[PDB]
Amino acid sequence: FVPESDGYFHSAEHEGSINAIMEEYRSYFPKWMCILNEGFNILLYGLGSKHQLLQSFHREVLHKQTVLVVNGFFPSLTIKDMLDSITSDILDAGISPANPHEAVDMIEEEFALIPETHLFLIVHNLDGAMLRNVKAQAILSRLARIPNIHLLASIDHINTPLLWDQGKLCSFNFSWWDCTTMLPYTNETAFENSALSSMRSVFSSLTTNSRGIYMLIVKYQLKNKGMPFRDLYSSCREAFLVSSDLALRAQLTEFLDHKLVKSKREQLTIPIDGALLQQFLEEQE
Amino acid sequence: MDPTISVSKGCFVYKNGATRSLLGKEVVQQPFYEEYRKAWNQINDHIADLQHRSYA
Amino acid sequence: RNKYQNARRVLNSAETQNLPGRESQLQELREFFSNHLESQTSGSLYVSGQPGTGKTACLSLLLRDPDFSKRLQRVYINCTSIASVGAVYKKLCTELQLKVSGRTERDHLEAIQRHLKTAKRMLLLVLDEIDQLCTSRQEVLYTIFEWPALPGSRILLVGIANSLDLTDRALMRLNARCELKPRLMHFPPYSKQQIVEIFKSRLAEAEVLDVFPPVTLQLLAAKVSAISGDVRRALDIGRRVVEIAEQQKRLKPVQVTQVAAVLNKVYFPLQQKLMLCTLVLMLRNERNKDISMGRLHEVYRRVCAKRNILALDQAEFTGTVDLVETRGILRIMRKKEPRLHKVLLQWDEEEVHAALSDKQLIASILSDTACL
Amino acid sequence: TPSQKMKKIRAGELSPSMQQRTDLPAKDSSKSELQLAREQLHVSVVPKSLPCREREFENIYAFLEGKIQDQCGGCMYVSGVPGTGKTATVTGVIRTLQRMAKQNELPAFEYLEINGMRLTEPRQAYVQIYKQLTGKTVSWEQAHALLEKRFTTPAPRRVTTVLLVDELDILCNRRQDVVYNLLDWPTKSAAKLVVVTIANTMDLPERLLMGKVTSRLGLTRLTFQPYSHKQLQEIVTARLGGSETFKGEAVQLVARKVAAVSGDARRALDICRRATEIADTAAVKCVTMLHVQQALAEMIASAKVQAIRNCSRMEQIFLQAIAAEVTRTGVEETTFMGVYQQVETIAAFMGVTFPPPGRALRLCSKLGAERLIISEHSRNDLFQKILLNVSADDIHYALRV
DNA sequence: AAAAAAAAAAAAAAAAAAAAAAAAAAAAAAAAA
DNA sequence: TTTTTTTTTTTTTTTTTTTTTTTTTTTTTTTTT
Ligand SMILES: Nc1ncnc2c1ncn2[C@@H]1O[C@H](COP(=O)(O)OP(=O)(O)OP(=O)(O)O)[C@@H](O)[C@H]1O
Ligand SMILES: Nc1ncnc2c1ncn2[C@@H]1O[C@H](COP(=O)(O)OP(=O)(O)OP(=O)(O)O)[C@@H](O)[C@H]1O
Numbered sequence A: 001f002v003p004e005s006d007g008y009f010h011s012a013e014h015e016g017s018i019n020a021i022m023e024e025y026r027s028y029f030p031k032w033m034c035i036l037n038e039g040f041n042i043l044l045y046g047l048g049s050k051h052q053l054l055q056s057f058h059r060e061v062l063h064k065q066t067v068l069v070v071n072g073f074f075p076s077l078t079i080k081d082m083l084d085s086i087t088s089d090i091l092d093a094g095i096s097p098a099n100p101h102e103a104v105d106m107i108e109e110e111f112a113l114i115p116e117t118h119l120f121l122i123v124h125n126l127d128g129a130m131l132r133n134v135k136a137q138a139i140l141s142r143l144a145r146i147p148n149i150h151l152l153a154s155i156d157h158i159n160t161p162l163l164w165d166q167g168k169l170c171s172f173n174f175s176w177w178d179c180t181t182m183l184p185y186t187n188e189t190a191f192e193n194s195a196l197s198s199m200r201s202v203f204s205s206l207t208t209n210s211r212g213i214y215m216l217i218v219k220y221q222l223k224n225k226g227m228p229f230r231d232l233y234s235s236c237r238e239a240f241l242v243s244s245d246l247a248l249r250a251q252l253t254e255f256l257d258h259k260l261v262k263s264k265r266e267q268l269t270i271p272i273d274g275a276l277l278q279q280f281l282e283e284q285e
Numbered sequence B: 001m002d003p004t005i006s007v008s009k010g011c012f013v014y015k016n017g018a019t020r021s022l023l024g025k026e027v028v029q030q031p032f033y034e035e036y037r038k039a040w041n042q043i044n045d046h047i048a049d050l051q052h053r054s055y056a
Numbered sequence C: 001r002n003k004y005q006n007a008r009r010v011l012n013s014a015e016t017q018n019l020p021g022r023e024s025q026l027q028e029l030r031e032f033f034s035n036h037l038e039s040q041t042s043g044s045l046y047v048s049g050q051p052g053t054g055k056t057a058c059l060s061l062l063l064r065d066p067d068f069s070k071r072l073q074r075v076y077i078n079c080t081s082i083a084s085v086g087a088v089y090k091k092l093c094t095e096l097q098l099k100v101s102g103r104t105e106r107d108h109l110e111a112i113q114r115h116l117k118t119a120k121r122m123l124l125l126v127l128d129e130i131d132q133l134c135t136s137r138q139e140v141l142y143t144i145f146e147w148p149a150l151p152g153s154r155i156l157l158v159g160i161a162n163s164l165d166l167t168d169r170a171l172m173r174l175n176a177r178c179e180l181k182p183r184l185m186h187f188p189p190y191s192k193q194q195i196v197e198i199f200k201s202r203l204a205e206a207e208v209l210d211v212f213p214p215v216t217l218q219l220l221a222a223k224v225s226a227i228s229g230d231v232r233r234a235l236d237i238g239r240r241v242v243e244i245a246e247q248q249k250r251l252k253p254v255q256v257t258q259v260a261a262v263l264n265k266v267y268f269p270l271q272q273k274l275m276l277c278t279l280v281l282m283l284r285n286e287r288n289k290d291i292s293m294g295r296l297h298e299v300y301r302r303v304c305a306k307r308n309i310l311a312l313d314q315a316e317f318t319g320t321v322d323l324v325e326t327r328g329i330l331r332i333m334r335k336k337e338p339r340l341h342k343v344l345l346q347w348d349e350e351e352v353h354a355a356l357s358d359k360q361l362i363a364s365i366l367s368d369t370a371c372l
Numbered sequence D: 001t002p003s004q005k006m007k008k009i010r011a012g013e014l015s016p017s018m019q020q021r022t023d024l025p026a027k028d029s030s031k032s033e034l035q036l037a038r039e040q041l042h043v044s045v046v047p048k049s050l051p052c053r054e055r056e057f058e059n060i061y062a063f064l065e066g067k068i069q070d071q072c073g074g075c076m077y078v079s080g081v082p083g084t085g086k087t088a089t090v091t092g093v094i095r096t097l098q099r100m101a102k103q104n105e106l107p108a109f110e111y112l113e114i115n116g117m118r119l120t121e122p123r124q125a126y127v128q129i130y131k132q133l134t135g136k137t138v139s140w141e142q143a144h145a146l147l148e149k150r151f152t153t154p155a156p157r158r159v160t161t162v163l164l165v166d167e168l169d170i171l172c173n174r175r176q177d178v179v180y181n182l183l184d185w186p187t188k189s190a191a192k193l194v195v196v197t198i199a200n201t202m203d204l205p206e207r208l209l210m211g212k213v214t215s216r217l218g219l220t221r222l223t224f225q226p227y228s229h230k231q232l233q234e235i236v237t238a239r240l241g242g243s244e245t246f247k248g249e250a251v252q253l254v255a256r257k258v259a260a261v262s263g264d265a266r267r268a269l270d271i272c273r274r275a276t277e278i279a280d281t282a283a284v285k286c287v288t289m290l291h292v293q294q295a296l297a298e299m300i301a302s303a304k305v306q307a308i309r310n311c312s313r314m315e316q317i318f319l320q321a322i323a324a325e326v327t328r329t330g331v332e333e334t335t336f337m338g339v340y341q342q343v344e345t346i347a348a349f350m351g352v353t354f355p356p357p358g359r360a361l362r363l364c365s366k367l368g369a370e371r372l373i374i375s376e377h378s379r380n381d382l383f384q385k386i387l388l389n390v391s392a393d394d395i396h397y398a399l400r401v
Numbered sequence E: 001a002a003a004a005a006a007a008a009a010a011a012a013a014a015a016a017a018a019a020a021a022a023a024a025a026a027a028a029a030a031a032a033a
Numbered sequence F: 001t002t003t004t005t006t007t008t009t010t011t012t013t014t015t016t017t018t019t020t021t022t023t024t025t026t027t028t029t030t031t032t033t
């Protein structure tokens, strides 16, 4: 691949094809066991989702082994979870220490005492949302250096070796494999890291006084095409909509709770264009 | 979907007899594995001996 | 003894057996529990509403209903009475008489997960005030709301809360799968006629209906449904009416004037006057609302110099500003030094001028622009 | 072993008594009239019938008598600035109801009290309530579980329990679980709990309490307004009684100068005691108005003129230079370098020499320790920021006149 | 291209969560009889 | 062999440190002139 630098300076048959692709990639599994036996690690870097390929490798080959499957695309994953998992559930040694490199030192000292006890770990999306810092990659490369622990991992981002220096890349004794399936990213992109109807459904649950307050806000916003706090308080006090100022601050905090009006510095700007506010103002009549 | 696509956890332990030589016997007793083991151990011991004689 | 005390007894703002305002909601929950008992499928449910709308009353009524006592096993958990967010599992084992190896939360979690797979009876798990289980990562709430997706589990769980969009803000990832999405149910706040029917039911419960004419019930219910709409405020004002009528008259029915005075009730030192007058003057004659304590005290000293009043020093002025902040008129942003505290007025100037009731003084302060 | 002592302390078996005097205390026959007026004017000697708080007494007594006789339980919130007789009125209502319960004119009740400022954590509230039913000191989880079993499970014959919560805003935290548990237990039918909560801020339930907690707190409120000068005069005149150790205008002067500042009753009762101790030294049997003016000058102090008058020469030159630099550049926060330039100007005008900057930092540290100015650490010399904590007219009054 | 608002980001204070330490309690080993 | 004492390990409770939330202030970007 050669990217041209000047652009920076000027700035059916598909299913059977994927089935044949997956059978071709399932042919590579005894070669992967022979490669993992000699001390290398497996890294896959194709285009499509390599989740199902690694899961079928775990089911069809590593069925009786100690396998820690780590979902790197999980947005609430931490290194504390993986290290607590290795020290507690596999090795029965309780909670790992709060220093994670000390926990990896403990894991090396404990796996030195048990030869012919191999921990496999399968990390879908090694460049995941909580493994893109340098410390987590240092911990994973220190884990991959142990002769008992073997590693399979997926790579999806385009800037992945920007955080692997040559020490991490010699610890990660990788065998790079082009496992390019064409499967879409359903399981990887579903999580938390990746309207006027909502405004009407929130306005359905309002009471009468809050309805009058938001009516005053939208009427002033559409008359003058944000609004101040003092004129709003005088408008709510002239219509007997409120008892004090702090009840207006409570109702405006309730409005900001539901993302209906936006406070600024107190400026009150409704973050939806004027035309849909005009349709909403004509909706009540 | 899958058993390992849980919304709560991120890690899944499949411990089978873990406490506090990956291949079978049918591949190791093949002669190319023994020959590769002997040749690689010879080359690695020679490279280690050369590095020792360099660093001593 | 008399009838005002009997109304004061029977309004009571406490747990009741008959729920006249909640008749479609109880039937909807009954249809939910019946459709998940007869099909023997699991399900999540999230009820939400304003504080005082009758959610806990509906679910506490259905958890004593004998038609569901035989088919399913009911467990109620209030999430404010738990010592920690990760401790709820232990409490659930305590609510299920489970036998755990114990002494770690993961053991209680695996005991619950072993119980939910081979249970002899369907479980109904109600978690009240579930917003206390929200944390940074929310491992506990996502573990609890995933037990419908457990293999072979028959747990069905209800979560009661206040915000309408808790499962859309703090439980977004459950929207990734259509199975794990909790069915929403909003309890609307009470209207006027529902509060009138609640009052008439509670007054006919002890035959004290003669004490309240219908017009005070309609006026009070219209006011409560206009402001807040919850029945706790309705029963509180309906009890304060009879507890002012009993102390005032000591059989005369409660007229519209007394409930009007109660609804207008529900819905000064000299140096504090000179502090508030100086703050009103400095907010009028300057567009900068960043007023410190020393900058306010330096103008206050000139103001009391012009009135021939011995002004306080800084040490007593700070306590004066705090004693006015206790009324809610001000707000003090605290800093490292007491000279640098920031006084922010939170009342309108008409409200300050009305609360002082000293027009001949504040008319003289605002005419004294030269001491600024 | 002292572990038996701690085992009996946590179980409440040995009472926490205190050491006693080797001398018997004095008799009331050997005291003078001024000593008796000084003993009656102590703030700790609370009277049986409080003046000026009769309507609040009627309000709290009507609420508590109704909640006890109806056997229901509920909640009240009284509030007001400190010194306005909140806790004294509430505990007087409790003592009157206990006197009526000892004479079979009322159903019996158990009265518990906690203070939010005598706890280190709000969760320790659970340790204190359970220490007032049984007397055992347990962990807060076990105490909360036992209180929950007591108030949720119905058991005849349960008696009404009146729970007083002083300083409610110290029990409020980010989660608000202690205050929600204390305001949710009366809402259950099996608990005969009446919670009366006392605090200072009037808008506390809407300011920092959540919607369910202010929903359970209720609308039956009471506000203890500050005392006017007639009310402070009536308080102090009722404290003195039938004596003539105070003048009729001295009490009025204390009342007018205290009711204009805070409205506190502790302030008037302490200023009158200081006036009594001043009159005891001047060998007069009465407390005239001059002793009251001397006590009002001493207790309502303003000693930032005498501090600048008692500074040294270079410190007063430094105080002139900070004000001159504030006048020159306009801004209030001035660095040390411009202040030292103005120091050189003022010292060359006065004809005296000044210390080097290393000792001018010592003068600045001395003035900043006394809080006449606000200064930083002296590690960043010549660039540390100086605020003038005293007003600029106070220096020009203290040094000219 | 500058003046002025405005949203994003950093600093800092404050409260909670987690780790660590210390004490209480229960189980085990060794002496008393 | 059975009972009582002293050691050891586990579990609970309290303290301290680290992280997280929340408020404030700055600060670089965007709109208007
Ligand atoms: N439909 C009704 N009819 C009569 N009384 C009712 C009704 N709904 C609620 N109540 C009264 O309101 C109280 C129960 O309110 P509930 O606790 O259900 O509100 P909530 O929404 O749970 O409040 P929060 O959200 O603050 O917990 C009981 O005292 C009950 O007597
Ligand atoms: N009306 C009164 N008559 C006589 N003495 C009074 C009166 N009001 C207050 N005092 C005296 O002033 C003191 C006020 O103490 P109290 O505990 O009542 O104040 P408080 O309002 O509870 O203060 P805080 O809010 O700070 O706790 C009491 O010790 C009492 O002796």
Ligand SMILES: [Mg+2]
Residues within 6 Å of the ligand: C056, C128
């Ligand atoms: Mg409830």
Ligand SMILES: [Mg+2]
Residues within 6 Å of the ligand: D086, D087, D166
């Ligand atoms: Mg008090």
